[PDB]
A paper describes a structure:
[name] is a giant, elastic, sarcomeric protein with a molecular weight of more than 3800 kD. [name] consists primarily of two types of protein domains: fibronectin type III ([name]) domains and immunoglobulin (Ig) domains (ca 100 residues in length) that account for over 90% of its mass. Despite the repetitive composition of [name], a single main immunogenic region ([name]) has so far been identified in its chain that elicits the reactivity of almost all known anti-[name] antibodies in MG patients. This 30 kD segment, also termed MGT30, consists of a domain triplet of composition Ig-[name]-[name] located in the [name] segment at the junction of the I- and A-bands (I/A) and corresponding to domains 4 to 6 in this region of the chain, i.e., tandem I109-[name] also termed I/A4-I/A6,.
Author numbering: -1 to 196
């Protein structure tokens, strides 16, 4: 038996004032022996030595503390075996601490179809910029004609599609969508026009 190959899908995000969040996927080959953990190392782009942040990580994610806002950090993860750590996986580009994580951008071109006397089927596109955190679903609001007071239609939805139901026969409705990531919900999207029943 031998050492594992390198971890996969090494990404970062959730950049705060003094931390960054690393996320990865297991290696393709364990070496013939089950893995024991992961090694997480950092190295500021203007410094020459990798320093070990943590060892024997069992999760597929790690939050690195104690980062100095306005530096740039490299990161690499390896996988642990009965034989010791395997080859390292690197982040794609340095982590820059000045730009914190925020709320996601508004979703894109909202569309509608399948209108009934009671329901409408709405689709939309994911936003371009998630704000530095992965998107955790979407929120759909509807606003009746005789009002400007929006009401959430159901619960968050991970898909970029939702069938709105519970609509009153013959009434006029416009719909808008917000995306959500870790630090909350986007400024709402480009609203639709008012649509009735059939």
């Amino acid at each position: 038996a031998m050492e594992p190959s390198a971890p996969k899908e090494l990404k970062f995000g959730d950049i705060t004032k003094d931390s960054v969040h690393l996320t990865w996927e297991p290696p393709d080959d364990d070496g013939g022996s089950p893995l024991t953990g992961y090694v997480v190392e950092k190295r500021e782009v203007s410094r020459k030595t990798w320093t070990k942040v943590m060892d024997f990580v069992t999760d597929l994610e790690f939050t690195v503390p104690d980062l100095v806002q306005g530096k740039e950090y490299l990161f690499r993860v390896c996988a642990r075996n009965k034989c010791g750590p395997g080859e390292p996986a690197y982040v794609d580009e340095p982590v820059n601490m000045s730009t914190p994580a925020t709320v996601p951008d508004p979703p894109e071109n909202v569309k509608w179809r399948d209108r009934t006397a009671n329901s409408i089927f709405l689709t939309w596109d994911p936003p371009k910029n998630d704000g530095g955190s992965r998107i955790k679903g979407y929120i759909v609001e509807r606003c009746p004609r005789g009002s400007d007071k929006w009401v959430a239609c159901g619960e968050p939805v991970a898909e970029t599609k939702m069938e709105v139901t519970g609509l009153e026969e013959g009434k006029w409705y416009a719909y808008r969508v917000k995306a959500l990531n870790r630090q909350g919900a986007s400024k709402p999207s480009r609203p639709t026009e008012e649509i009735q029943a059939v």
